[PDB]
Amino acid sequence: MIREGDKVVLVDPRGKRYLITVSKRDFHTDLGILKLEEIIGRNFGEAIKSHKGHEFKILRPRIVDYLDKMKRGPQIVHPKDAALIVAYAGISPGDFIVEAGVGSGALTLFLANIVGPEGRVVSYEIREDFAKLAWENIKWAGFDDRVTIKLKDIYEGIEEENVDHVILDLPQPERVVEHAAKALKPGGFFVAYTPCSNQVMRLHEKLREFKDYFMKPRTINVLVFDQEVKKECMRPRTTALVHTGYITFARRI
Amino acid sequence: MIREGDKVVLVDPRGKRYLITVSKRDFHTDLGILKLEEIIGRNFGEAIKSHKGHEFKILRPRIVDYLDKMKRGPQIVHPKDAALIVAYAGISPGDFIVEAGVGSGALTLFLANIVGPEGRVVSYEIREDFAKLAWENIKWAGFDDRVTIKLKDIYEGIEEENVDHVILDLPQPERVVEHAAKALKPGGFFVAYTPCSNQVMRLHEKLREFKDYFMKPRTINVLVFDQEVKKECMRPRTTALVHTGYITFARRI
Amino acid sequence: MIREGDKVVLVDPRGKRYLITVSKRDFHTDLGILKLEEIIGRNFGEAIKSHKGHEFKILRPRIVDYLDKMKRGPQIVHPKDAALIVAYAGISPGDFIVEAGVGSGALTLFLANIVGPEGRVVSYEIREDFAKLAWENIKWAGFDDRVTIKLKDIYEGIEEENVDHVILDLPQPERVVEHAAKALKPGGFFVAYTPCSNQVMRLHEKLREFKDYFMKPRTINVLVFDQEVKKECMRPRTTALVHTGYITFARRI
Amino acid sequence: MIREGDKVVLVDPRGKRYLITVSKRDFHTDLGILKLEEIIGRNFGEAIKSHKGHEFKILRPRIVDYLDKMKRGPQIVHPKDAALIVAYAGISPGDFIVEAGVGSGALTLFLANIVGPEGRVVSYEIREDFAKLAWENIKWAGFDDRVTIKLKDIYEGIEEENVDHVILDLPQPERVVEHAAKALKPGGFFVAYTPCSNQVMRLHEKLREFKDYFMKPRTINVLVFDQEVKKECMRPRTTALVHTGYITFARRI
Ligand SMILES: Nc1ncnc2c1ncn2[C@@H]1O[C@H](CSCC[C@H](N)C(=O)O)[C@@H](O)[C@H]1O
Ligand SMILES: Nc1ncnc2c1ncn2[C@@H]1O[C@H](CSCC[C@H](N)C(=O)O)[C@@H](O)[C@H]1O
Ligand SMILES: Nc1ncnc2c1ncn2[C@@H]1O[C@H](CSCC[C@H](N)C(=O)O)[C@@H](O)[C@H]1O
Ligand SMILES: Nc1ncnc2c1ncn2[C@@H]1O[C@H](CSCC[C@H](N)C(=O)O)[C@@H](O)[C@H]1O
DSSP states (O other), X not given: OOOTTOEEEEEOTTSOEEEEEOOSSEEEETTEEEEGGXXXXXXXXXXXXXXXXXXXXXXXXXXXXXXXXXXXXXXXXXXXXXXHHHHHHTOOXXXXXXXXXXXXXXXXXXXXXXXXXXOEEEEEEXXXXXXXXXXXXXXXXXXXXXXXXXXXXXXXXXXXXSEEEEEEOSSOGGGTHHHHHHHEEEEEEEEEEESSHHXXXXXXXXXXXXXXXXXXOEEEEEEEXXXXXXXXXXXXXXXXXXXXXXXXXXXXX | OOOTTOXXXXXXXXXXXXEEEOOSSEEEETTXXXXXXXXXXXXXXXXXXXXXXXXEEEEOOOHHHHHHHSOOOSOOOOHHHHHHHHHHHTOOTTOEEEEXXXXXXXXXXXXXXXXXXXXXEEEEOSOHHHHHHHHHHHHHHTOTTTEEEEOSOGGGOOOOOXXXXXXXXXXXXXXXXXXXXXXXXXXXXXXXXXXXXXXXXXXXXXXXXXXXXXXXXXXXXXXXXXXXXXXXXXXXXXXXXXXXXXXXXXXXX | OOOTTOEEEEEOTTOOEEEEXXXXXXXXXXXXXXXXXXXXXXXXXXXXXXXXXXXXXXXXXXXXXXXHHSOXXXXXXXXXXXXXXXXXXXXXXXXXXXXXXXTTSHHHHHHXXXXXXXXXXXXXXXXXXXXXXXXXHHHHTTOTTTEEEEESOGGGOOOOOSEEEEEEOSSOGGGGHHHHHHHEEEEEEEEEEESSHHHHHHHHHHHHHTTTTBOOOEXXXXXXXXXXXXXXXXXXXXXXXXXXXXXXXXEBO | OOOTTOEEEEEOTTOOEEEEEOOSSOOOOTTSOOOTTSSTTOOTTOEEEOTTSOEEEEEOOOHHHHHHHSOOOSOOOOHHHHHHHHHHXXXXXXXXXXXEOOTTSHHHHHHHHHXXXXXXXXXXXXXXXXXXXXXXXXXXXXXXXXXXXEESOTXXXXXXXXXXXXXXXXXXXXXXXXXXXXXXXXXXXXXXXXXXXXXXXXXXXXXXXXXXXXXOOEEEEEEEEEEEEETTEEEEOSEEEOOSOEEEEEEBO
16 A cells, blocks of 8 residues: 555654655664665555564654654744644634744644645745745645745735734744734634743733734643653653743734 | 524623524623624624623634533543643544543544544443533534544443544543554554543553553643733733643554 | 640641630630630640530641731742742851841741741831731741841841841842842842742842852742642642742852 | 861852862862962951962851752752751751651751751661761761761661651651651651652551541642743743652641
């Protein structure tokens, strides 16, 4: 069922994953040489063995795989932040999303997945090299069909109209507030990710100026604690990622 | 555009949301009486008035309104927990999900909206009053098309096959592990939400025993702090919801 | 034995405490009337019974009982914040402490307990009613031996010299930095408690300006989670106190 | 004023501290030889110079210095946890404390500082090399007067009686419960520090068997978030110490 050119997740015995394109070349590993040609005509769930006899399993790549293994220009918007943006903004299949700060394309890949083949994500970017690398990430993930990158400064305006969500992770989201109020559907969401307290203060004040266009804003911070579970001791993992950014939501009119 | 029988969200000046089916009747509010018939023939983004001069904005119902306004039992799975289920398990449009513990239909509604018209959710439930209640909400939210509620003890087995995700909020997820291993696609996710660390210990024991059926399980705990942001003062809100439940993820072999 | 005028802690069957003054007057309770005079001749570890038959145990009042049961114009600086102030700044028996913001006298009580009968806490306060209130609180607790309340505005200066610590919980702690710099012993701690980010920002501004007077400042934030532990279920408590204030520490060169 | 044999902290133009016993010798350091003969007869707040020009400040050793610079091999109980133990148990000058797990002496130092010259700390230990290292640390910090270490297993029993607090950092505190019930004064505190949920569950089980000797227990967990305050950005430190141990408190009768 797998043909040349298709993408595949190879899982080694230790649980390490390789998101691979099937082709006539021999992939090198910790644990021997895979001949990726042997994968043609196999099914997901079958295995291939390296030259030293270690078994690698073939999985269909999912969004988590693409997200986990893309070329990143550190940092990004993290899974957990993307998650709450989706939840509290209620992003849905079919939604039309404008986003600014395409970066590596991480938030874009996640949002593209949520809106499906019939949703649209339009990403703004001002940095040429980030646009060229994001686009390569989005083609690689197959979202080629639903995402458009505009090499354009969103501060100067939003061309689009009747958008479901404006989602931002750039330095000054306050400079987009006025444009978002025009672009957004009634009941549409303005969403911003900001690492600093200062950015929140500014944004909240701008959103107060635009009380007539937005509902009362909401700013959250998400923490995720991994648990270390064993036979005897169950306890939280000693260190954790405590802070990425704040997320501010505001409903339109 | 708005016709009889459609569902609409009315927003009052304060920002109180009313989820209403538009029909020929009068609706009684703390800001006076409304005639829903005046909504008919109008478009989203427009306003109707009350017999005290107070305006009511008309918005298209989004998933977040349904989750906010549905009938409930006591405990539920909160948006943040479902958010991370979605993010960490890679729940995508078109997915086939098995969930047990429908309860009030909160989680099921969340997942139904993520999977889209072409995804499917099958929910098991042992408690006949909950099943009726949950089904009441999904027809109401319009996910009629994609959701099926089984009145069946999931511990007896999972009749579905090639499922993308098995997602549990029930007292003993360990008693579903063997079943889910057979039901899940290669690469699919077992996901369990458990309030106590006892549950997690027991569940981790079962997954340990099924080592050759799942990758290394990870267990997480998610906290969300709201921020009180004023002109003079930005502090985290004094009080917060600090624990709902632990979430455990395991990918199938 | 216990005599008239002694202060005592009555613990009821449900574990509830009552800090009481022993005297010929009968005290009214959920569980019946207590003849407090019957607590004369009795000793710590003994009990007395209400007219409804219920037994109240007699304990020696400790610092936690005074802190837990005093008259507040709430909220105070919470015992979690005061603990970390003590621990991080090294507050020891015999210390000479200047604090400003006597308020209810809660912080003052805590530090007074720490410094001991031979230590000194000098508390500044600009409000006559608070000063009366707190002084009544500290008498009540037996600390009038070691605490001084100066009805004076600390922004105008600190009369004391060679102080161990300057501990602040007032709105503009930056206006005390210079005075604290000159009041503190070498190795003495400037400590401020500030509910808002904004206050931390200004206080960091001022401490940068006086870098030649202070080591690098450190701002913490402390959360305490309660656990629900029962035979079956052990989980963190659902709701917690998430924020009181930030605490900044600065060592004098 | 400062004579031979006394202890002194040296602060350099970076901020780093060195705690030494003052005696005539060319002290080897990163910024050049010190020669601690220029220091004798000086006062605190003065400066002494090396051969490379730079200046070193003389500070009086506080409890924070001893806890920083001590030989601290084995994992300590953390300052934040010591703090809440002090706070919630109401540990006061002059208290009599039995503690088990002397470890390196860290928790023993901190407690010995709080109970003061007239308090007593009896530390139990079963490991020789730990006991030798612990006694060598407390003598160095000057608490020889108030601390005794017993090379004896606390599970076998508690020799002392009428004690203020039993403070534990060992693997099975539930075995010390009955002994503590005998040793503690009316209103005294049993305090145990456990890194695992399991340990807490066992302990709570024992404490409830001893409901007639103890008030309902209270288990807590403390987190400290460091704040990053730069001129143009305030945010929490990205990473933070999230879990060290749970702490359980119970009042005797
Ligand atoms: N006005 C604008 N329009 C479109 N993209 C923008 C933009 N301003 C910035 N960007 C892009 O948005 C991305 C994130 S900017 C980096 C944000 C950083 N975490 C912070 O602390 O603020 C970058 O790729 C940047 O080039
Ligand atoms: N074996 C089973 N099959 C299907 N549904 C079940 C089930 N056991 C419980 N449920 C349903 O799942 C929902 C949540 S059960 C309550 C969960 C609890 N907090 C715990 O984990 O301990 C209820 O609606 C209940 O009827
Ligand atoms: N310059 C100053 N000198 C002395 N006390 C001051 C002061 N500024 C404020 N205070 C006192 O410090 C205390 C804390 S004020 C900050 C907390 C807040 N205003 C509240 O009341 O909850 C108050 O009792 C106030 O009267
Ligand atoms: N019954 C007992 N009496 C006295 N000390 C004990 C004891 N059981 C354990 N200890 C000591 O208590 C301390 C903490 S024990 C828990 C930490 C971990 N097991 C470790 O050693 O790294 C150790 O110093 C240990 O030697």
